[PDB]
Enzyme design. Structure first.
Site, PDB file in Angstrom:
ATOM      1  N   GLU A  35       0.776  -1.247   0.000  1.00  0.00           N
ATOM      2  CA  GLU A  35       0.000   0.000   0.000  1.00  0.00           C
ATOM      3  C   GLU A  35       0.808   1.298   0.000  1.00  0.00           C
ATOM      4  OE1 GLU A  35      -2.773   0.989  -1.128  1.00  0.00           O
ATOM      5  OE2 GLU A  35      -4.034  -0.368   0.059  1.00  0.00           O
ATOM      6  N   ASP A  48     -10.746  11.834  -8.902  1.00  0.00           N
ATOM      7  CA  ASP A  48     -11.838  12.647  -8.352  1.00  0.00           C
ATOM      8  C   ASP A  48     -11.638  13.643  -7.209  1.00  0.00           C
ATOM      9  OD1 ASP A  48     -11.327  10.598  -6.393  1.00  0.00           O
ATOM     10  OD2 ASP A  48     -13.369  11.041  -5.548  1.00  0.00           O
ATOM     11  N   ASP A  52      -4.741  10.076  -1.397  1.00  0.00           N
ATOM     12  CA  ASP A  52      -4.417   9.008  -0.442  1.00  0.00           C
ATOM     13  C   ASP A  52      -3.131   9.380   0.296  1.00  0.00           C
ATOM     14  OD1 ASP A  52      -6.676   7.640  -1.377  1.00  0.00           O
ATOM     15  OD2 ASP A  52      -5.568   6.078  -2.214  1.00  0.00           O
TER      16      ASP A  52
END
EC number: 3.2.1.17
Length: 129
Positions: A35, A48, A52
Site C-alpha cells: 500500500e 476525483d 491518499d
C-alpha cells in the site's frame, strides 16, 4: 519515515492492531507494505479530487480533511497531513474506524488483491513481538 517490515510490525502491535476486528497482524503489515511501502509520507491522487495519505493510504473524501477534496465529510476528524508524520497513531487510530464500518480490509484495494488469502504470517516471521 519509511518503516522496516519487522519494525512496523512491532509498532502496530504496541498500538492495538493485532487481531483488531479479527485481522492478524500480518494482514496489517502486508497491507501497508504493498500500500505505502513502509513509507508514512507517501501520497496518492486518484482522479476525483481525492488523495491518499500515509502508511495505510487512507482516503480524503471520507477519513481525513486535506482542504482540497470537496466531497469531504471528515469522519476521522483529522487533517490528512497528520497521517504522514513518523508517528502512526492517527493512521492506526483512523484505520480502526475503516476496518469497523463494514467491509473489513476489503476497503483497501491492495490487501484484497495481493494479501487476502496468502499466508500473511510470513510478513512477521523473524519478528520479536
Amino acid at each position: 519515515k519509511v518503516f522496516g517490515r519487522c519494525e512496523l510490525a512491532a509498532a502496530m502491535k504496541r498500538h492495538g492492531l493485532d487481531n483488531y476486528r479479527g485481522y492478524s497482524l500480518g494482514n496489517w503489515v502486508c497491507a501497508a507494505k504493498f500500500e505505502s511501502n513502509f513509507n508514512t509520507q507517501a501520497t496518492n491522487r486518484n482522479t476525483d479530487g481525492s488523495t491518499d495519505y500515509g502508511i495505510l493510504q487512507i482516503n480524503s473524501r471520507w477519513w481525513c480533511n486535506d482542504g482540497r477534496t470537496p466531497g469531504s465529510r471528515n469522519l476521522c476528524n483529522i487533517p490528512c497531513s497528520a497521517l504522514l508524520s513518523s508517528d502512526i497513531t492517527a493512521s492506526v487510530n483512523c484505520a480502526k474506524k475503516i476496518v469497523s464500518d463494514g467491509n473489513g480490509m476489503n476497503a483497501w484495494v491492495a490487501w484484497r488483491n495481493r494479501c487476502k488469502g496468502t499466508d500473511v504470517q510470513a510478513w512477521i516471521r523473524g519478528c520479536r513481538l
